CSV table of C-alpha atoms and ligand atoms in Angstrom, one decimal:
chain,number,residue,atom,x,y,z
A,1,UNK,CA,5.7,3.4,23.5
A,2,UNK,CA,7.6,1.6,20.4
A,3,UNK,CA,10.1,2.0,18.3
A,4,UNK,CA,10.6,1.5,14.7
A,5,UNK,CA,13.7,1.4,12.7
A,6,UNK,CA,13.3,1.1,8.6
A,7,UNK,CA,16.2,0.4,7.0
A,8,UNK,CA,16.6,0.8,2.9
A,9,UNK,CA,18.6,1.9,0.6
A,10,UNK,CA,16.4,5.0,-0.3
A,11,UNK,CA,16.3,6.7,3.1
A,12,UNK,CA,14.2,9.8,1.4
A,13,UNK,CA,11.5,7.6,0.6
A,14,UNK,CA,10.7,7.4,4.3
A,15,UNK,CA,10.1,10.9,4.7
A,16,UNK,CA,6.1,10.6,4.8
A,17,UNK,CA,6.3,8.9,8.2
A,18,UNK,CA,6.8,10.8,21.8
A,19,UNK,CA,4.3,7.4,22.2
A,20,UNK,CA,6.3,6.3,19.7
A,21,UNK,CA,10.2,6.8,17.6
A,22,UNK,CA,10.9,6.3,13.6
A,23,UNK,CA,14.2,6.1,12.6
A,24,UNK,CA,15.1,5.4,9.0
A,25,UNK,CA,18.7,4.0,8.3
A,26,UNK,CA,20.5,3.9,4.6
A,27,UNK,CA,21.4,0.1,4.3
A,28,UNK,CA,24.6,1.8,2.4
A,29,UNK,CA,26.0,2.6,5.6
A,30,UNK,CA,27.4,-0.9,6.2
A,31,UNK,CA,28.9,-1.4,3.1
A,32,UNK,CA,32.5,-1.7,2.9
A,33,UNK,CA,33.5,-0.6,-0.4
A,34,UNK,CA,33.9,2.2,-2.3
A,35,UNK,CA,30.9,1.1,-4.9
A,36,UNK,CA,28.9,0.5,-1.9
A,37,UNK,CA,27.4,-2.7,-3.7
A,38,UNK,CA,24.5,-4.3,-2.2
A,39,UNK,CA,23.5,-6.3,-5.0
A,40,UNK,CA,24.3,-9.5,-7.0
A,41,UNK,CA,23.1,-11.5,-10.0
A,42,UNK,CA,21.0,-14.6,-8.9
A,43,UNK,CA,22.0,-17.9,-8.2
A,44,UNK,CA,20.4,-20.5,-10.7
A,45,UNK,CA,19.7,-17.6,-13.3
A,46,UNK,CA,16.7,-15.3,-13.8
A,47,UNK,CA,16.2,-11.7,-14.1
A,48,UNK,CA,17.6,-8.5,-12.1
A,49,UNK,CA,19.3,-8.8,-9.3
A,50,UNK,CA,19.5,-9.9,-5.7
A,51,UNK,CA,20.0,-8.0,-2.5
A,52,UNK,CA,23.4,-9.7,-1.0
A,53,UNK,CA,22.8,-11.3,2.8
A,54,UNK,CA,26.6,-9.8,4.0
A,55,UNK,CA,25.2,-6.4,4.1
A,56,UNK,CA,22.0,-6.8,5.8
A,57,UNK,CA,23.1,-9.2,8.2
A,58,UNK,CA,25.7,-6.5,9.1
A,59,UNK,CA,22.7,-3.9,9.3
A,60,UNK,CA,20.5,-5.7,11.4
A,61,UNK,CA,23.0,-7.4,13.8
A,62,UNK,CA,23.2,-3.6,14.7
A,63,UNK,CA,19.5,-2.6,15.0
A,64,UNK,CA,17.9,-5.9,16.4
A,65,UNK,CA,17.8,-7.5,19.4
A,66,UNK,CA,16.0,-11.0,20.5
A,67,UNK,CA,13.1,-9.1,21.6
A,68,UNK,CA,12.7,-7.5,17.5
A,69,UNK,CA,9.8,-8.2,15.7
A,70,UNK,CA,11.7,-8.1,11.8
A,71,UNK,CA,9.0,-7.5,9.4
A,72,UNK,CA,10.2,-8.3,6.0
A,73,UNK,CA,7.6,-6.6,2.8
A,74,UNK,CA,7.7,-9.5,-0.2
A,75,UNK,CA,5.0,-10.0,-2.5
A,76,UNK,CA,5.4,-13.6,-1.6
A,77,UNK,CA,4.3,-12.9,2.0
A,78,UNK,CA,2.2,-13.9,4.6
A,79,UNK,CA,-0.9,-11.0,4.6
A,80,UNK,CA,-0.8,-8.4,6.2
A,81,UNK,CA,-4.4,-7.5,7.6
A,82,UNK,CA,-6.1,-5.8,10.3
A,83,UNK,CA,-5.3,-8.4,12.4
A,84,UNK,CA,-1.6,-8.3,11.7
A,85,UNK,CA,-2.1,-4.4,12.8
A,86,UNK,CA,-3.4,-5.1,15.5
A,87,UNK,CA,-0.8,-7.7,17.0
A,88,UNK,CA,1.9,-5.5,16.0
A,89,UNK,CA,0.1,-2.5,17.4
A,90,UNK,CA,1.7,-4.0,20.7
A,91,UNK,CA,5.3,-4.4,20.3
A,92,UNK,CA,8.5,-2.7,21.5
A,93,UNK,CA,10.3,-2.7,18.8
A,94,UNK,CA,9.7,-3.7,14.9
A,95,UNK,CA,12.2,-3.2,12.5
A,96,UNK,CA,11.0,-2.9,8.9
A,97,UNK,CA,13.6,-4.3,5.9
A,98,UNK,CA,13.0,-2.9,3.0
A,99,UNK,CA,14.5,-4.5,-0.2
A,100,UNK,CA,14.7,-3.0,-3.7
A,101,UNK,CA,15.9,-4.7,-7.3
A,102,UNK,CA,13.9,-8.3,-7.3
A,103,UNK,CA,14.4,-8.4,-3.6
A,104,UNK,CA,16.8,-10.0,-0.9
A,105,UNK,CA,18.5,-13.4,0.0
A,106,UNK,CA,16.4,-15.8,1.6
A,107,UNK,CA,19.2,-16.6,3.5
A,108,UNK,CA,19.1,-13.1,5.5
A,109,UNK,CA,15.5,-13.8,7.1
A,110,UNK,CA,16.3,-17.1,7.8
A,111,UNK,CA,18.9,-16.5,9.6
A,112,UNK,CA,17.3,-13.6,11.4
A,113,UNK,CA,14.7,-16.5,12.4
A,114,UNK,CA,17.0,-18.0,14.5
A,115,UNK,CA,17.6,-15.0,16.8
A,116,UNK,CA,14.5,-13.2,16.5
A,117,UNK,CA,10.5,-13.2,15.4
A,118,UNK,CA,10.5,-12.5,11.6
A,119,UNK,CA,7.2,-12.0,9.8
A,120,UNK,CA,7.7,-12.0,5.8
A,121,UNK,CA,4.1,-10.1,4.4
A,122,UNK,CA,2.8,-8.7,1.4
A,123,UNK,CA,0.3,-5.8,1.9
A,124,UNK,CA,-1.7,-6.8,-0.8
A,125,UNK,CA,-1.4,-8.8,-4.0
A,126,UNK,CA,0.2,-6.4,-6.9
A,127,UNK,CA,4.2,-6.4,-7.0
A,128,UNK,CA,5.6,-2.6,-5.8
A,129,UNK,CA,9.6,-1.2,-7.1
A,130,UNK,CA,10.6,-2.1,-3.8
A,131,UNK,CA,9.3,-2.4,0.2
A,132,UNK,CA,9.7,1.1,1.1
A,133,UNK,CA,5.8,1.9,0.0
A,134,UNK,CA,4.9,-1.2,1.8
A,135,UNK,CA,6.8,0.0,5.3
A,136,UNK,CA,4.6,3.4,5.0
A,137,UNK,CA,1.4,1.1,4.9
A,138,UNK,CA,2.7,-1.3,7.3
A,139,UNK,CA,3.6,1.8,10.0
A,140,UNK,CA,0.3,3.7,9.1
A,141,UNK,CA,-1.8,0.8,10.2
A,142,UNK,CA,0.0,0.2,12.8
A,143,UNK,CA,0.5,3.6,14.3
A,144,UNK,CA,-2.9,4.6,14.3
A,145,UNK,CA,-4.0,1.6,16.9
A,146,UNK,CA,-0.9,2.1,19.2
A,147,UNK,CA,-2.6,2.9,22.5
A,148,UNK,CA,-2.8,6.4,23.1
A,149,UNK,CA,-3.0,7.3,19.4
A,150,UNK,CA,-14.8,-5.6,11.7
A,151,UNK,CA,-14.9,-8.6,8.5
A,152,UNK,CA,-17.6,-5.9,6.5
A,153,UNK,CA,-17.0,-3.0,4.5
A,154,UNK,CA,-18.4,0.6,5.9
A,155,UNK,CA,-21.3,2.2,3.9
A,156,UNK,CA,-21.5,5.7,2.5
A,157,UNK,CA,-21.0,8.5,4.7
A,158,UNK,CA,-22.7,12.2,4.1
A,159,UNK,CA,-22.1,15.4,5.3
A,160,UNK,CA,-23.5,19.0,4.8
A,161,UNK,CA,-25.8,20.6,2.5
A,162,UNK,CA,-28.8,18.0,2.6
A,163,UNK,CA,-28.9,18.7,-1.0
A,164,UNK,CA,-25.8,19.0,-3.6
A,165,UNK,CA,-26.0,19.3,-7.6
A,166,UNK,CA,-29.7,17.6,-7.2
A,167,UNK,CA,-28.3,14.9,-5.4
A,168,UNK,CA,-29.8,14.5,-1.9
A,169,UNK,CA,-28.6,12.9,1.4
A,170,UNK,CA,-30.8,9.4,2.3
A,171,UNK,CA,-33.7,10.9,4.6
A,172,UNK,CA,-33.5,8.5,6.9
A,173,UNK,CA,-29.9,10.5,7.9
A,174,UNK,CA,-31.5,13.8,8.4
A,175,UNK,CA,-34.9,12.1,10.2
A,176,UNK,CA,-32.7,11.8,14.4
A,177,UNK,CA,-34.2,8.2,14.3
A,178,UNK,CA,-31.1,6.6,15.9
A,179,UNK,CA,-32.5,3.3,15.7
A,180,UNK,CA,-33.3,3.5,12.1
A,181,UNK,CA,-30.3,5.4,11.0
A,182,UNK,CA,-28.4,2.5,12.9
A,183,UNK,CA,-30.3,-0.3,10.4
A,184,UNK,CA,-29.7,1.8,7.3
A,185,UNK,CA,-26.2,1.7,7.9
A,186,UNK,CA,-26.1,-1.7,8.6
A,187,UNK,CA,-27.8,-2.8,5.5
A,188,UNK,CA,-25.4,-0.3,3.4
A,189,UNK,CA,-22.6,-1.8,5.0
A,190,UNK,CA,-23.9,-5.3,3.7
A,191,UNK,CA,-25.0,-4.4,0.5
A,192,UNK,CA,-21.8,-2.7,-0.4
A,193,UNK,CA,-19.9,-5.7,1.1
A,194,UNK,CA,-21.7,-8.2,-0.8
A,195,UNK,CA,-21.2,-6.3,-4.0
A,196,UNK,CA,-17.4,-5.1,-3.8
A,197,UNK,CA,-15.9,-8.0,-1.9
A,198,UNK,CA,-18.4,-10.9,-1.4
A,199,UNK,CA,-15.5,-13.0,0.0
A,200,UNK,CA,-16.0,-11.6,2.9
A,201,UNK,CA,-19.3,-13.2,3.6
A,202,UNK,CA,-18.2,-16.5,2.2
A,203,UNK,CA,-19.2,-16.3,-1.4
A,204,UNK,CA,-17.1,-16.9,-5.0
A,205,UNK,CA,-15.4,-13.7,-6.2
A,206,UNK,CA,-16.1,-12.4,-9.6
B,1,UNK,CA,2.0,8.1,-22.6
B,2,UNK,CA,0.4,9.0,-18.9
B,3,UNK,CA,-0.9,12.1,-16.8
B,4,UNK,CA,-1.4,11.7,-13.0
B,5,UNK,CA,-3.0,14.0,-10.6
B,6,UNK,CA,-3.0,13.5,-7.1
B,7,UNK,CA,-5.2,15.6,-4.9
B,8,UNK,CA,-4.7,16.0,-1.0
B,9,UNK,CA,-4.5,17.5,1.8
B,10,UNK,CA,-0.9,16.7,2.3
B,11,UNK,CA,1.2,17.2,-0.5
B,12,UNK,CA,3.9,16.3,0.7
B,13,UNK,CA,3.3,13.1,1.2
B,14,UNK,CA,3.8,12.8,-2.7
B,15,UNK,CA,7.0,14.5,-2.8
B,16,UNK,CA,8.5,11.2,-2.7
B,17,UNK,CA,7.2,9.2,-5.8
B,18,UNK,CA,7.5,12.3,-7.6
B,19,UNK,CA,11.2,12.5,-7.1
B,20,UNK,CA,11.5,9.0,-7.9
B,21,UNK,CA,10.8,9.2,-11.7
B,22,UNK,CA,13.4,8.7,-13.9
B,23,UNK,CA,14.5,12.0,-16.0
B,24,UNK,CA,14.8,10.2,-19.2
B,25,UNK,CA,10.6,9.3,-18.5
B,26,UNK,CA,9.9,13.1,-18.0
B,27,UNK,CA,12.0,14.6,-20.9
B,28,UNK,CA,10.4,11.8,-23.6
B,29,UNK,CA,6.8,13.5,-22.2
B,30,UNK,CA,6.4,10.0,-21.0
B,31,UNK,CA,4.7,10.3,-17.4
B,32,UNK,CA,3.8,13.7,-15.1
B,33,UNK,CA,2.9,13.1,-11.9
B,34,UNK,CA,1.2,16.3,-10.3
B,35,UNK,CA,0.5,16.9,-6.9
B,36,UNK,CA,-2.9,19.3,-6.2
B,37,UNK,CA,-3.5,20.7,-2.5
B,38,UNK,CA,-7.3,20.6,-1.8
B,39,UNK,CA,-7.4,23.7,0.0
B,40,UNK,CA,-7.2,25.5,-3.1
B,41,UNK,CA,-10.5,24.9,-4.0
B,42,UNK,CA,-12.1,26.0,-0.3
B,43,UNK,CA,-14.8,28.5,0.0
B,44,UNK,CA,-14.1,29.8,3.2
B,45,UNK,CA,-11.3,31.9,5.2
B,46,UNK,CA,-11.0,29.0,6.9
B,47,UNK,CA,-10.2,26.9,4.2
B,48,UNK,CA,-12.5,24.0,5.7
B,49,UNK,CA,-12.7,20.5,4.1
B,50,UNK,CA,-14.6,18.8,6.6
B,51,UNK,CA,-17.8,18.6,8.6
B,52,UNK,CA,-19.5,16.5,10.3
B,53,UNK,CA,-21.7,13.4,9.3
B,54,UNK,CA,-25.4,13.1,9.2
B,55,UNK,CA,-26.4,10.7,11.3
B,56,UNK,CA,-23.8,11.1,13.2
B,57,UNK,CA,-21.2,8.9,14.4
B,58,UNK,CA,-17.6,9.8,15.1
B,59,UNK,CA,-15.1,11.4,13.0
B,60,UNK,CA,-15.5,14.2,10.2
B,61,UNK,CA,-16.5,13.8,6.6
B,62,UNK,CA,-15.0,15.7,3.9
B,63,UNK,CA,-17.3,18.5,2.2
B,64,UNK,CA,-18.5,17.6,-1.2
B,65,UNK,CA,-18.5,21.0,-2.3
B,66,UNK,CA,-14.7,21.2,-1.6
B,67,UNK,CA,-14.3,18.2,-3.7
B,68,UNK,CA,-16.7,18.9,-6.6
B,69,UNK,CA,-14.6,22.2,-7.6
B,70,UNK,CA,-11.4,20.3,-7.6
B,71,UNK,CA,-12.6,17.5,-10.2
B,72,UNK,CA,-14.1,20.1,-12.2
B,73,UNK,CA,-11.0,21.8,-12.5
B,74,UNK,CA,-8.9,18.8,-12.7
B,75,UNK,CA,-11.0,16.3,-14.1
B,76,UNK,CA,-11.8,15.4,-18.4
B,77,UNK,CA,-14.4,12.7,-19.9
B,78,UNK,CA,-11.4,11.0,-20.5
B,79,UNK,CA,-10.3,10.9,-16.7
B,80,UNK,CA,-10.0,7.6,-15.2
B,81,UNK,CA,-11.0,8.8,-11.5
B,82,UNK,CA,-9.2,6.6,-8.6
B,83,UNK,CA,-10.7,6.6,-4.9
B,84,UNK,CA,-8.8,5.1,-2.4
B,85,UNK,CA,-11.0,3.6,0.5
B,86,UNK,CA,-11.0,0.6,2.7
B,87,UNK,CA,-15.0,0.0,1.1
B,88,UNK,CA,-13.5,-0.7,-2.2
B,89,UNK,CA,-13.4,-2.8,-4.7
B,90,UNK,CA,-9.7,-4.8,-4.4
B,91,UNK,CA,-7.0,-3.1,-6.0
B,92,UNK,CA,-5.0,-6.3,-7.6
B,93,UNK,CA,-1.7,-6.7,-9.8
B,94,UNK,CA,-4.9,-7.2,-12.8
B,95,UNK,CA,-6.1,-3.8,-12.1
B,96,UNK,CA,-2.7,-2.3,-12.4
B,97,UNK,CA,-2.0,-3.8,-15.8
B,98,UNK,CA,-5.9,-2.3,-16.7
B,99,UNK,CA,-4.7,0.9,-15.3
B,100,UNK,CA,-1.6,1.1,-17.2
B,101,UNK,CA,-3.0,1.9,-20.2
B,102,UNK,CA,-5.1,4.9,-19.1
B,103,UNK,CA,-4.0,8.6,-20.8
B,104,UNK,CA,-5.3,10.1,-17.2
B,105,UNK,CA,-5.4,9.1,-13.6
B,106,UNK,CA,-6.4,11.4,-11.2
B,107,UNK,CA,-6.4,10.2,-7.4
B,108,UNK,CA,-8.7,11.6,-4.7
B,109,UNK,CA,-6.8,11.1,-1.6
B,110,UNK,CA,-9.2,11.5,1.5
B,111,UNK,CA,-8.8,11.8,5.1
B,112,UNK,CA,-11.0,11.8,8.1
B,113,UNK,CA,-13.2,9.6,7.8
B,114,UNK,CA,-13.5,9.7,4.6
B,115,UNK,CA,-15.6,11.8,1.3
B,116,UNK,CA,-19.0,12.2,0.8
B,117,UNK,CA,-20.2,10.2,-1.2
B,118,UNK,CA,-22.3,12.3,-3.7
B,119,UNK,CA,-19.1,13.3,-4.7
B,120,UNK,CA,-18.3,9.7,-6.5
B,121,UNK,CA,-21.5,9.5,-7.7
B,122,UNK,CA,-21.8,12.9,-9.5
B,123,UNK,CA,-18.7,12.1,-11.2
B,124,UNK,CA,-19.6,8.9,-12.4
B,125,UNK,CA,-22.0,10.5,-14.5
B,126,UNK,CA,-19.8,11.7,-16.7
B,127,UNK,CA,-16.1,9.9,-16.0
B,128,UNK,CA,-15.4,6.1,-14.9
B,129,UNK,CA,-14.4,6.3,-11.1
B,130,UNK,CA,-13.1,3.7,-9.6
B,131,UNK,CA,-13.0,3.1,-5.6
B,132,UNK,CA,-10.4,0.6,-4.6
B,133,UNK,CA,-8.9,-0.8,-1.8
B,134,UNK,CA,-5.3,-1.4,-1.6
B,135,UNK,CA,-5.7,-4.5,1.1
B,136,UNK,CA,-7.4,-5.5,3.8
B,137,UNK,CA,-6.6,-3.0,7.0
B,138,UNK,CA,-7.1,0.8,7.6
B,139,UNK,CA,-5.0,3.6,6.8
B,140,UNK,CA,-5.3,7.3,8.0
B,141,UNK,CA,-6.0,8.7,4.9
B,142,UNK,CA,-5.6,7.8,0.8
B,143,UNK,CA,-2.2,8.8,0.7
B,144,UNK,CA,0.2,5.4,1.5
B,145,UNK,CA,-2.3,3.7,-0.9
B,146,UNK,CA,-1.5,6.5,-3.6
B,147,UNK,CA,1.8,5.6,-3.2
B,148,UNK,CA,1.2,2.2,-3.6
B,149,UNK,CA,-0.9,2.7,-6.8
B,150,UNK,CA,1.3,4.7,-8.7
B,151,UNK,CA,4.2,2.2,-8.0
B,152,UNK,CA,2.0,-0.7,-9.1
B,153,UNK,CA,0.8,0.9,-12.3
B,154,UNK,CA,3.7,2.9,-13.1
B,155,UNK,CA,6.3,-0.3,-13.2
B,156,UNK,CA,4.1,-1.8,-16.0
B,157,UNK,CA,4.3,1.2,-18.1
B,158,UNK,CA,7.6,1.1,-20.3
B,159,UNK,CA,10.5,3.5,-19.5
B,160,UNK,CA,9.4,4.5,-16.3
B,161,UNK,CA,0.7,-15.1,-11.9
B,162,UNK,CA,-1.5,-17.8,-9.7
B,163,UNK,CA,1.6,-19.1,-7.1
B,164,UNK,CA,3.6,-17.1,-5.0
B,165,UNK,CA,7.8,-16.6,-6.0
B,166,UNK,CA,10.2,-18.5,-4.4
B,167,UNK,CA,12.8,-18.1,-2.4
B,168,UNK,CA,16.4,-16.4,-4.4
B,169,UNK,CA,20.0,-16.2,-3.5
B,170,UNK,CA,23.1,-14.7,-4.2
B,171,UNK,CA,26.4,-15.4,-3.4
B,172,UNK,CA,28.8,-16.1,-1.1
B,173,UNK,CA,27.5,-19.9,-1.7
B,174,UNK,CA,27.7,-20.4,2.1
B,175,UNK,CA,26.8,-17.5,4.7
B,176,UNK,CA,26.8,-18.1,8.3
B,177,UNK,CA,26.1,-21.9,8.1
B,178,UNK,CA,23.6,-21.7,5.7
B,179,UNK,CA,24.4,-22.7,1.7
B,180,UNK,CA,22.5,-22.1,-1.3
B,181,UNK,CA,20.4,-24.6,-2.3
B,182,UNK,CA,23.2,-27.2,-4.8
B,183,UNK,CA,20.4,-27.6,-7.4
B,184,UNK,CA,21.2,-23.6,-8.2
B,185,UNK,CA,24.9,-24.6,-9.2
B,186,UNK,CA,24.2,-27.7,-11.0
B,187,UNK,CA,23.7,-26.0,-14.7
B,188,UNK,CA,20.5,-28.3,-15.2
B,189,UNK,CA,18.5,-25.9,-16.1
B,190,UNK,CA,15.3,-28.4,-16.8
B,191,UNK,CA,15.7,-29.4,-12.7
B,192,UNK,CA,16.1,-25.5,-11.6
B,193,UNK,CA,13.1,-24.9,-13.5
B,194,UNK,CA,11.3,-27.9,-11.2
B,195,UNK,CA,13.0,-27.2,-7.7
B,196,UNK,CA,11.4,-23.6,-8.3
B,197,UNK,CA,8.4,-24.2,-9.5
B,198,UNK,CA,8.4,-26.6,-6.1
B,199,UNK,CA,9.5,-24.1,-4.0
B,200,UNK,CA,6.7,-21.7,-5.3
B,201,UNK,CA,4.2,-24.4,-5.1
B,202,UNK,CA,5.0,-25.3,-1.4
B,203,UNK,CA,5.4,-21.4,-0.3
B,204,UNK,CA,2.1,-21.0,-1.4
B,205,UNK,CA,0.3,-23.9,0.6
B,206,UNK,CA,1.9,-22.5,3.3
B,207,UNK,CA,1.0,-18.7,3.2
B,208,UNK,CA,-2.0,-18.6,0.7
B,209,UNK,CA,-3.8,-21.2,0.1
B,210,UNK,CA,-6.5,-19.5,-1.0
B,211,UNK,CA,-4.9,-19.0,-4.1
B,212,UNK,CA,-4.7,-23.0,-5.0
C,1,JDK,N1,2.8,-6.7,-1.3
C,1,JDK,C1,4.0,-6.3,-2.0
C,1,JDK,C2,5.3,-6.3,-1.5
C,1,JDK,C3,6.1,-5.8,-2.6
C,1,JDK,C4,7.6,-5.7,-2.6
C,1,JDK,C5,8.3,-5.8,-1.4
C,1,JDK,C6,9.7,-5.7,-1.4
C,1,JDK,C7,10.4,-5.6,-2.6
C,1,JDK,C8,11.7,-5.6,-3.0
C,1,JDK,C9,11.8,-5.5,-4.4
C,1,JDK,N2,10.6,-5.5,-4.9
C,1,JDK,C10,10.2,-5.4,-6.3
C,1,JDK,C11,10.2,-6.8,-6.9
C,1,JDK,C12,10.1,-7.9,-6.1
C,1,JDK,C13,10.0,-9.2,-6.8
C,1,JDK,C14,10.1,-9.3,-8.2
C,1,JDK,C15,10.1,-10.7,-8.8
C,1,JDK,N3,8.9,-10.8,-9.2
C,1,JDK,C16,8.0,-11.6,-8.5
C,1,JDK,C17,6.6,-11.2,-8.8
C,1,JDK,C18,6.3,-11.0,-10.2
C,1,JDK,C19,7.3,-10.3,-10.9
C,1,JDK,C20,8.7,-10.8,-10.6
C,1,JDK,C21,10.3,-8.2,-9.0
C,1,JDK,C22,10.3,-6.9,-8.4
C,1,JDK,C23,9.7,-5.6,-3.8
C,1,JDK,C24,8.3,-5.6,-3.8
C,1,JDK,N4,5.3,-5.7,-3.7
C,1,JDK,N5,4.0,-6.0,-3.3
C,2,JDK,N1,-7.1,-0.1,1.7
C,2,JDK,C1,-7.3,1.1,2.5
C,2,JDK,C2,-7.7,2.3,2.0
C,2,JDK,C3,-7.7,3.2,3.2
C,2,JDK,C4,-8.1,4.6,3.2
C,2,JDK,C5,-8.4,5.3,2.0
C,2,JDK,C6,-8.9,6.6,2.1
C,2,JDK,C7,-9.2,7.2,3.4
C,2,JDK,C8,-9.7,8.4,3.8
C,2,JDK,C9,-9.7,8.4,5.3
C,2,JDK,N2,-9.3,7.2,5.7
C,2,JDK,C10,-9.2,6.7,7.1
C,2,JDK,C11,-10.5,6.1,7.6
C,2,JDK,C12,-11.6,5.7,6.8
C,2,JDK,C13,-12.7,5.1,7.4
C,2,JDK,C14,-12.8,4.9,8.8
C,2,JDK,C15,-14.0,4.3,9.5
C,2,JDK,N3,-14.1,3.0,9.3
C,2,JDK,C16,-15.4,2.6,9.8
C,2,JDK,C17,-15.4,1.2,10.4
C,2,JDK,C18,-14.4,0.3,10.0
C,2,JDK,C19,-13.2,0.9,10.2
C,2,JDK,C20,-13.0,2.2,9.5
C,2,JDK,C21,-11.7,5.3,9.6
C,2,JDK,C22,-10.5,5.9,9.0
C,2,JDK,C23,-9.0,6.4,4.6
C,2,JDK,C24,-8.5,5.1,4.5
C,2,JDK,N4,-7.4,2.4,4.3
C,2,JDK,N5,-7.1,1.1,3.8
């Protein structure tokens, strides 16, 4: 059982999305004027613009409680990993703001820190139009360990016919040896890890 | 000028980006972003695209056969050939400038548990394929990190670095208790430039240090 509230100004976005209840909320909605501006030219100078805090503030006084996990998408975040998945995989109730243009006022999550938990995360280091992409990663990760729904990459995997274009499947998949299918997969996991991301077993990257 | 193809077993899931380019992008034969169901190229009444793995283990693995038509079909020598998978090589804001530049992307979205992998390597005999991960946690499928990769590479095209950003603000200059930093109104541009590159500095100790 949790809920999840995204709110944005692109509602439609969220359309990819009973253990668990989505609802997606146009940030418009607590606007007060008949431009239904949400956005500003930054303080100090710099390009594009700046989500105002008034707005959001108004949203999420609405939506959250004391008990909200806010989860913030920035490309200046803390990371979201596995990890993060599965701590959050736990909670009642997260509530995903998503900003658009160069993003919102600081201001709004740290105010939101004094009433609530607020996690500010990137889901990976390239910069996105906005955090709605990042809230349909975000909820897919976290969705899929919610119960009732390790630090090495996973080898190949093969499926039927044994042979394909001339290209056979390892032999030591087809041979029932559980034991030595087991190693083989082991040492593909590895091997793949120490070529794509040797990080992960403590060595430079490329 | 750039061609995307996306294939999947849930089109849908696309409908959004799609939507999300800009007319003007379209008209000027700028972008085209087209979204292929898999189940076209099925063999069977059943229109199957998975079976399960040798060796076994849980989960299904999706039928190369399936997949081999569709690349055929969809797929040129000049095709820059984009599998997402959490076994990939990293998918960074360096790969999306790379990517930019492509005439042809086409994404194999997989689900299950993922594609076999004869499939990758019979088309890296005649196209440069590329299997990427978009971060560092598991999805359901290649879908979300579609999304993401036509965001990320389609923001750098026109028309359509080391330290994390600091923080930005707008006005009102005060907003419940809480004032934008003076500096910002001082019109010294020379010290803005410093209290950022401060801010930037110090927000990145704190959240990524691995980057310093
Ligand atoms: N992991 C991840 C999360 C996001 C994300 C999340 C939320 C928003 C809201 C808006 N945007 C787009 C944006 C944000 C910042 C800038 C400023 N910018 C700093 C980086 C270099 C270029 C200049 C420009 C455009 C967002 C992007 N992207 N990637
Ligand atoms: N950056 C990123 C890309 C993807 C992605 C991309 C494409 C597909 C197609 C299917 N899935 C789901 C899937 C794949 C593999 C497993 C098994 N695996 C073995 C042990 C370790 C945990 C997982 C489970 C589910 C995909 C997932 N996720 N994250």
């Amino acid at each position: 059982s949790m809920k999840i509230d995204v709110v944005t100004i692109f509602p439609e976005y969220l359309q990819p999305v009973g253990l668990v209840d989505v609802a997606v909320h146009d940030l418009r909605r607590w606007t007060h004027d008949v431009h239904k501006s949400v956005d500003d030219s930054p303080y100090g100078g710099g390009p594009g613009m700046v989500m105002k805090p008034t707005v959001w503030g108004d949203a999420l006084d609405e939506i959250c409680t004391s008990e909200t996990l806010l989860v913030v998408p920035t490309p200046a975040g803390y990371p979201f990993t596995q990890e993060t998945a599965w701590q959050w995989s736990t909670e009642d109730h997260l509530v995903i703001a998503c900003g658009r243009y160069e993003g919102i006022d600081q201001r709004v999550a740290d105010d939101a820190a004094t009433r609530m938990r607020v996690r500010e995360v990137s889901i990976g280091d390239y910069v996105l139009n906005g955090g709605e992409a990042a809230a349909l990663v975000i909820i897919e990760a976290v969705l899929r360990l919610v119960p009732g729904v390790a630090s090495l990459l996973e080898g190949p995997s093969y499926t039927r016919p044994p042979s394909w274009r001339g290209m056979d499947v390892p032999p030591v998949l087809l041979s029932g040896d559980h034991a030595k299918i087991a190693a083989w997969r082991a040492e593909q996991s590895r091997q793949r890890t120490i070529e794509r991301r040797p990080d992960l077993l403590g060595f430079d990257s490329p």
